[PDB]
Amino acid sequence: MTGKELFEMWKIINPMGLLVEELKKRNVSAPESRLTRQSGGTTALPLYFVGLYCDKKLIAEGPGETVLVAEEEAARVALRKLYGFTENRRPWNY
Amino acid sequence: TYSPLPDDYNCNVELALTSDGRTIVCYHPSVDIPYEHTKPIPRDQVLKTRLEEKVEHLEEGPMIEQLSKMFFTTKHRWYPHGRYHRCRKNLNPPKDR
Amino acid sequence: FREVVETTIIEGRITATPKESPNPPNPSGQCPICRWNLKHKYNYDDVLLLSQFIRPHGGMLPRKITGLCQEEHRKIEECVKMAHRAGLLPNHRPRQLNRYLTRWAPGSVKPIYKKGPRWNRVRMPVGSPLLRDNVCYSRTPWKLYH
Amino acid sequence: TVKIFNITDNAAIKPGTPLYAAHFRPGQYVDVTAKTIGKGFQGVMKRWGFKGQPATHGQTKTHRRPGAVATGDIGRVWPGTKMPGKM
Amino acid sequence: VKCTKARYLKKKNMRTLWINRITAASQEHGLKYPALIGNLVKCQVELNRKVLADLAIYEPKTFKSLAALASRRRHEGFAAALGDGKEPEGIFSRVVQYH
Amino acid sequence: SSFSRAPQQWATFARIWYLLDGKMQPPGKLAAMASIRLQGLHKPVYHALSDCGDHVVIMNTRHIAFSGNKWEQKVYSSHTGYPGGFRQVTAAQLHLRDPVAIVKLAIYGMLPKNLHRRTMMERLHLFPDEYIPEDILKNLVEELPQPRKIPKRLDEYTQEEIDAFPRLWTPPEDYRL
Amino acid sequence: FKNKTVLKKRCKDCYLVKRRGRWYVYCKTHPRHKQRQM
Amino acid sequence: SYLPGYVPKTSLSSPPWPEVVLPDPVEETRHHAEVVKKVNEMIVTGQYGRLFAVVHFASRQWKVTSEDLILIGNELDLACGERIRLEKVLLVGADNFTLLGKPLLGKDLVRVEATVIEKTESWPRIIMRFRKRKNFKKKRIVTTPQTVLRINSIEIAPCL
Amino acid sequence: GGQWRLQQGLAANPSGYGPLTELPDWSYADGRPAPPMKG
Ligand SMILES: [Mg+2]
Ligand SMILES: [Mg+2]
Ligand SMILES: [Mg+2]
Ligand SMILES: [Mg+2]
Ligand SMILES: [Zn+2]
Ligand SMILES: [Zn+2]
Numbered sequence: 001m002t003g004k005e006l007f008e009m010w011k012i013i014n015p016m017g018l019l020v021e022e023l024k025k026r027n028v029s030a031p032e033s034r035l036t037r038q039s040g041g042t043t044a045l046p047l048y049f050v051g052l053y054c055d056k057k058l059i060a061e062g063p064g065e066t067v068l069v070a071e072e073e074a075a076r077v078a079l080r081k082l083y084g085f086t087e088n089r090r091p092w093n094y
Numbered sequence: 095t096y097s098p099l100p101d102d103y104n105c106n107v108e109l110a111l112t113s114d115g116r117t118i119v120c121y122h123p124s125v126d127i128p129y130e131h132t133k134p135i136p137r138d139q140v141l142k143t144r145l146e147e148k149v150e151h152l153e154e155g156p157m158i159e160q161l162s163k164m165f166f167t168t169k170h171r172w173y174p175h176g177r178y179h180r181c182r183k184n185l186n187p188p189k190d191r
Numbered sequence: 192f193r194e195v196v197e198t199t200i201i202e203g204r205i206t207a208t209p210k211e212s213p214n215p216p217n218p219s220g221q222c223p224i225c226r227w228n229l230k231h232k233y234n235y236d237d238v239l240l241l242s243q244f245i246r247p248h249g250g251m252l253p254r255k256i257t258g259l260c261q262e263e264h265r266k267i268e269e270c271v272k273m274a275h276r277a278g279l280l281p282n283h284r285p286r287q288l289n290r291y292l293t294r295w296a297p298g299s300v301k302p303i304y305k306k307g308p309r310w311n312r313v314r315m316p317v318g319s320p321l322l323r324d325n326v327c328y329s330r331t332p333w334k335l336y337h
Numbered sequence: 338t339v340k341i342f343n344i345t346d347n348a349a350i351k352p353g354t355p356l357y358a359a360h361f362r363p364g365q366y367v368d369v370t371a372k373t374i375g376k377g378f379q380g381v382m383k384r385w386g387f388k389g390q391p392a393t394h395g396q397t398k399t400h401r402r403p404g405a406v407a408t409g410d411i412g413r414v415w416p417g418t419k420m421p422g423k424m
Numbered sequence: 425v426k427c428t429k430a431r432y433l434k435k436k437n438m439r440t441l442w443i444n445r446i447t448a449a450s451q452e453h454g455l456k457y458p459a460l461i462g463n464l465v466k467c468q469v470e471l472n473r474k475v476l477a478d479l480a481i482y483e484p485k486t487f488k489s490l491a492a493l494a495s496r497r498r499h500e501g502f503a504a505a506l507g508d509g510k511e512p513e514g515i516f517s518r519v520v521q522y523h
Numbered sequence: 524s525s526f527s528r529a530p531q532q533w534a535t536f537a538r539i540w541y542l543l544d545g546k547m548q549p550p551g552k553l554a555a556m557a558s559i560r561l562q563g564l565h566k567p568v569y570h571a572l573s574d575c576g577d578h579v580v581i582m583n584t585r586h587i588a589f590s591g592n593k594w595e596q597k598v599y600s601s602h603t604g605y606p607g608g609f610r611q612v613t614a615a616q617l618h619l620r621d622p623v624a625i626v627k628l629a630i631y632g633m634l635p636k637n638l639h640r641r642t643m644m645e646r647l648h649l650f651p652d653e654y655i656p657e658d659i660l661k662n663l664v665e666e667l668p669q670p671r672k673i674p675k676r677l678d679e680y681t682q683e684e685i686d687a688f689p690r691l692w693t694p695p696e697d698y699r700l
Numbered sequence: 701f702k703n704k705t706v707l708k709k710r711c712k713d714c715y716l717v718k719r720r721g722r723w724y725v726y727c728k729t730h731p732r733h734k735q736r737q738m
Numbered sequence: 739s740y741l742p743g744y745v746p747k748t749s750l751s752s753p754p755w756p757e758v759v760l761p762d763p764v765e766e767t768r769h770h771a772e773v774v775k776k777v778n779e780m781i782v783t784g785q786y787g788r789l790f791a792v793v794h795f796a797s798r799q800w801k802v803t804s805e806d807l808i809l810i811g812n813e814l815d816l817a818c819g820e821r822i823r824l825e826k827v828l829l830v831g832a833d834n835f836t837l838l839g840k841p842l843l844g845k846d847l848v849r850v851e852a853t854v855i856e857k858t859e860s861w862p863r864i865i866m867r868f869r870k871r872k873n874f875k876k877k878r879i880v881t882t883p884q885t886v887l888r889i890n891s892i893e894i895a896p897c898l
Numbered sequence: 899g900g901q902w903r904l905q906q907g908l909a910a911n912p913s914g915y916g917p918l919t920e921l922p923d924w925s926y927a928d929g930r931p932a933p934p935m936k937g
Contacts, residue, residue, distance in 0.1 A: 002805060003191065005527065034132040039539050042658040044164050047537035056129045063526060063534035067136060073530045080525045087525045088833050090787035091804040094890065096761050098492035098499070099453060105485045107492045110773035112898050115518050117847070118467070118838035119774050119898055120489040120831075166578070166646050193699050205696060212689035216744040223691035228745050236749040238677040239688045246700055258692050279676040288615060289547050289588035291674070299721040302598050302613045317591035328753055337591060417605040425868045441570065449567040465899030470841040470912050471828060475792050475799045480567040483790070486829075486836050493838075499758050512763055515770070519906050520840050522917055674749070688746055795923050797913070814924075821927040826918065841918050851927060 002092075006085035007076055015075035019052075022082055029055055031078065033071045036061060050074045101125075222260040230263075231326045235273040235292065238280060245271055249283040266321045269294075273319070292318045340370075379424040387419075442473040449480035453491040463494035466501070467516055535568060538577050538646075540659070542666040545583030545626070549590060552670035554629035557581060560667075561634065561643040571639075578646045580659055585622040585651040588671075589614065599628065622651035701736045708735070774898045777835050781896045785834070789892040792829035793850055794842075799828060802850065806889035813883045816854045821890070824850035830894060837894075849893045856886035 001009070012018060020030055037049035048070035052060040060078035064070025080086050099107065105122035112119060152160065158172040195203050220226030224233075233240060244257060244267050251271060254264045274280055276293035290297070294316045303313050314336035323335060361367065381387040381403045390399045403421075407414050447457040464471065469490070471479075479487045493516065500514035524531060541560050543553060559565055563575035589597070597614040617624050627649060634640045648659060655663075694700075707716060707725045714727040727733035745751040761769075780786065790803040796810045802824075816822065827843045827850055829836065837843060860882040867876040900910035913919045925932050 007527070033135050034129070035135060036127045036132050038133075039537060039664050040662055042661050043166075043538075045538060047534065049534070050135070051127055051132060053129055053132070058126045058129075061127070063530045063537075065533055069530070071135075073527060076527065077525050085525075086787075088788045091891075096759065098496040099488065104488050107485075107489050108769075108773050109489070109493055109496060109516070110770040110777075111515055111518075112774055113771070116520055116840055117843060117898070118469075118493065118516075118840065119770075119777050120486070120493075120836045120838065121773055121777055121834070122485040122489050122836070123834050124485065162645075166642075168641050168645065171642075192694065193697050195699070208694055208696060209690050211693040212691075214740045216740045216742050227689065227691050228743070229691075229748065229751070232745060232751040233748045234750055236674040239680065239685065240691065240746075240748070242677055243691055252700070256695060256698055277674070279674060281676060281678055283677075288594045288618070289586060290590075290594065291547075291588055292590045293592055295592050295721065297592060297595055299719075300592050300595050301721075302611075303596050304598055304611055315591055315593055315596045326750060328750060337593070415604075415606045425866050428865055428867075444564065445567045445569060448565050448569055451565060452567070462899055462902070465912075466902055468840040469828070469838055470918060471792060472799050475801050475829075477567070478801045483831065485833075486831050489836060499760060502758070503760055514760075515763065515766055522908075684747070689740075794918060815933060822924045822932075823927050824924055826921055826923065841912070841916075842921070852924070 005087075006080060006083070012079075015072055015079055019075045019078050019082075022079070023054065031059065031075075033074065035067070052078050222263050223258055224263045225260070231324055233270070234322065234325065235270040235277065236279070237270070238274055241267065241271050241274055242280065242283065245280075245283055247283060248285055249275060249280060266319075269319045269321045294319055376424040378422065380421045381419065384421060384424045385419040439473060442477040445477040445480055446473060449477075449487055450491060453488060455491050455495055459498055460491060460494045463497040463501075464490065467493055467497050468520065469493075536573070536575065540578045540580060540662040540664050542663045543579060543581045544666070544669055545581065546586045546669075547588045547673055548669050548671050550584075550587045550626045550629045553581060553587070553626060554633050556667065556670065557630050557647065558633040561630070561647060574642075576639075576643055576646055578648065578662070580648045580650070580655065580663060581626060582650045582653060582655055584626045584649055585618075587618075587626065594618075599624075623649040701734045703738045704735045705738060707737055709733075777837075778896050778898045780835060781894055781898070786832040786894075789830060789832050789894065791827050791831070791848065791850055791892050793824050794826035794828055795824055802889040802892070804889060804891050808852075808887050808889065810885040810887060811860075811882055812885070813857065814854060814885045814887075816857075816885075818854055818857055820854040822852050822854065824852050824889075830892065837898075844897065847895060847897045849891075849895075851890045851893070852887045853890055854885060855888045856884075858884050858886065860884050 007015075023030065031052040031054050033050050033052055035048065036051040038047070040046035046065055048064050048067050050062055050064065050067065050070040050073075051058050052062075052071075052074045060074045060081060062070050062072070062074030062077050064073050097107075098109070101107065102125060105124050108121045110119040110121070111117075158169045161167075161172050162169055192206050192208055193203055194206060195201055215226045217226050217228050220228075224230055229240070235241075244259075245251060249271075251268050254261065257264065259267065271280075273291070273293055275283075276297065277291040278289075288297075303315065305313070307313050316335065317337050318333060318335050320335060323333060325333070327333070376383070380401050382389050382401045387403065389401050390396055390404075392400060403419075406418060406420065443457065446460065450457050450460045471490075476487075476490075479490065497516050500517045504511070504514065504517065526534065543557060545553065557579045560577050560579045563569050563573075563577060565577075566575055569575055594615045595613055598611050599614065599617050600609070600611045602608045602610070612620070614625060627644075627647075630647060631640070631644060634643050701724075707723055709716070709725060710733045711727050711730050713729045714725050714733050717724050717726060723737035725733060725735035788803060790801060792799055792801050795808075796812065800808050802808060825845055827848045828839055828841060830843060830848045831837065837847070862879045862881055865876075865878040865880065868874060903910050903912070909915060922932050923935065
């Protein structure tokens with residue numbers, strides 16, 4: 001299990017749906033996607049950082065080549081932070 | 095009222111020195127992008143909406159100049175390579191993390 | 192000051208003047224620059240001081256009237272020429288390429304067709320050896336020749 | 338053949354229109370452009386009007402040839418050299 | 425022969441790459457490379473250029489903290505040189521002595 | 524950051540469209556900072572085989588400034604290789620012919636002399652005036668600060684600093700001037 | 701004009717003027733005294 | 739009334755760099771105590787994860803983390819699978835805080851734990867010398883011994 | 899910073915007679931000191 005990512009081991013389909021279900025069941029307002037950062041946009045290699053906000057407070061941010069895939073990656077980052085599988089989490093104790 | 099660096103792009107950095115003076119303690123919580131600093135997200139009557147599948151075949155010159163204009167490169171990247179280089183290329187490269 | 196008017200009747204009249212600013216920080220100086228502690232602390236940008244020392248049509252004023260010492264007067268005249276060529280004095284005109292630090296008159300200088308070898312290169316002059324002795328505020332001195 | 342003529346905006350004519358010989362008038366001056374008579378591959382003598390070499394007086398197989406094409410110090414031939422080709 | 429001489433050139437080129445990346449990060453924080461290196465060795469952190477470039481790439485906050493420490497040491501040095509007397513030496517200009 | 528591998532790699536190695544202004548700036552300083560940005564030497568992830576260049580959009584290149592007499596001193600030399608192709612034009616003549624040629628040549632000089640220089644010059648974008656095409660304008664990020672300071676000619680000093688500057692000499696009352 | 705490296709006034713009416721980056725001796729009454737620094 | 743030493747505001751009467759005032763020492767030492775106590779209580783509660791360290795070992799500086807691998811270019815007189823403590827810790831850090839040694843951190847403050855997991859040799863390296871027209875040609879093959887260490891754990895203790 | 903190190907008395911190379919170069923690299927995890935290094 002050591003070197004792998006959460007959605008590399010457990011495949012999901014709709015991270016946005018899972019995220020809104022989790023926020024609803026822990027009594028958090030529905031997230032809003034906003035364009036935090038953007039480079040290119042008209043070219044063939046764009047860069048989008050989409051941030052997911054809740055009550056005007058940032059909960060996640062994600063990069064992508066398109067807006068939709070950036071929003072999906074931000075949803076996955078939100079799921080990671082909410083579930084405790086973040087990259088900088090405490091390593092396993094052996 | 096003094097900061098060694100501006101405190102609005104990466105982290106709010108505070109330097110400190112322990113009482114013995116033997117080690118330096120840094121505190122740097124990340125800065126978050128403000129909501130107000132963000133930007134809102136961007137947004138046949140009688141026949142089918144027939145799928146518009148045209149693929150015009152450009153000859154090599156026009157195709158390469160179109161690709162060069164698209165990706166901001168030269169033509170030499172798009173011109174092909176010989177069998178010697180094609181078979182010298184490693185098709186099972188090593189992969190770390 | 193003093194002005195002449197022409198109407199034939201011509202007349203010289205006296206107008207108001209500005210006097211010395213009240214308390215110079217160095218009253219023992221002999222030139223105004225020395226009195227105001229500006230000896231190596233001005234450039235061609237300082238059009239306040241330069242316009243204080245020029246005529247209304249862009250010419251310079253004499254050393255005796257200005258009270259300037261000879262070295263300061265020559266530095267003032269070179270700074271005024273460079274500021275005039277850079278276009279920093281749009282109201283002190285007589286009677287498109289952007290420049291600054293122009294030492295020679297632009298209409299008097301021949302192109303460097305044959306640059307030398309790198310031991311005898313024909314360099315291109317920037318600024319002024321009169322202003323060479325300015326305060327540096329850097330660890331590399333002024334490069335007078337490019 | 339189609340040809341492109343540079344005109345000002347006040348001389349625009351509707352496409353599909355006929356043009357005739359009386360478009361010009363006598364006592365005028367015109368410029369006439371055409372592809373010249375092609376002579377195929379020709380030597381220096383017909384192509385550039387070189388003088389060539391004498392016929393008799395000992396000459397070996399040189400009568401219509403270019404002589405020196407450059408100097409020895411130049412290790413090459415200059416671009417734009419007059420040499421045989423299509424005329 | 426090229427393999428051996430290239431061992432030498434590889435060490436040199438890798439140090440040049442580290443210096444380039446440290447200079448890039450320092451300019452990204454408004455600092456210059458000589459100021460960063462001299463101030464870190466004045467602050468007695470003996471991180472070499474390899475781990476400095478590694479921190480520049482992968483730990484931007486730790487590198488920002490190091491750049492802030494170096495800039496603060498620069499301002500202490502300028503203040504001491506300007507004062508020229510016997511003022512307090514500064515918080516981070518103190519030297520831990522060993523015996 | 525907890526990104527996935529492909530979005531993380533894309534975010535690290537993506538390109539940025541920097542903006543830069545002419546308007547009485549020296550083309551050599553413009554060219555130095557443009558050359559750094561075109562090579563990608565401003566990135567800590569830089570490597571010469573990583574193709575980490577960024578786009579640089581320089582405008583107002585018609586209003587550059589030469590220090591000194593470089594407009595008449597500096598000569599650009601080229602040779603159409605036919606015997607007699609040696610042409611030498613001053614910087615003034617080259618600027619009057621092509622408003623972007625001087626900045627283009629300075630950046631082309633400061634870029635490294637290898638096969639990547641032409642790709643970097645394709646990522647370079649130069650415009651002589653304030654007009655930029657709309658797609659490039661929607662691409663732009665980070666107008667970079669100008670290297671010079673625009674030394675602020677006499678008539679736009681406001682009255683506050685004009686009379687804050689003290690008067691250095693008293694003139695005689697009978698001088699004509 | 702005569703090209704000279706050292707310029708010498710030969711009249712009381714000669715005058716040294718620096719024009720187009722070079723020194724010149726101009727004489728109105730004796731035009732043979734025109735000298736051009738080189 | 740102008741001070742004896744006043745300069746009028748010209749382009750270079752004053753330094754180009756902005757004036758920087760440094761905070762007073764007493765308030766700064768109180769601020770240092772507050773920041774150090776804050777980082778210490780973060781260490782006590784455990785508001786951190788995935789520490790990294792810069793460790794001096796075998797004349798090199800390694801930026802290691804937990805569950806890591808490093809390759810030492812000499813033998814380490816240790817049996818395989820042997821747990822040792824790396825001690826010369828130049829840096830330890832987490833998200834939101836780092837600790838800096840001058841130049842080495844305290845052994846009470848930070849521990850690095852490593853495990854000898856492999857003792858091997860390198861691939862053969864060629865040393866060839868050639869000087870031309872002098873019949874000068876020499877070949878040698880070397881195999882440097884190596885030791886693969888797995889960095890297990892990086893632990894910090896509240897001691898600031 | 900060799901001149902600064904000489905002014906402070908801490909050699910010029912940081913790899914000379916300092917604690918950083920003269921302290922042991924490692925020790926056993928149970929606390930036993932390592933055998934002394936060859937250098
Ligand atoms: Mg004949
Ligand atoms: Mg025969
Ligand atoms: Mg015959
Ligand atoms: Mg070296
Ligand atoms: Zn004086
Ligand atoms: Zn005469």
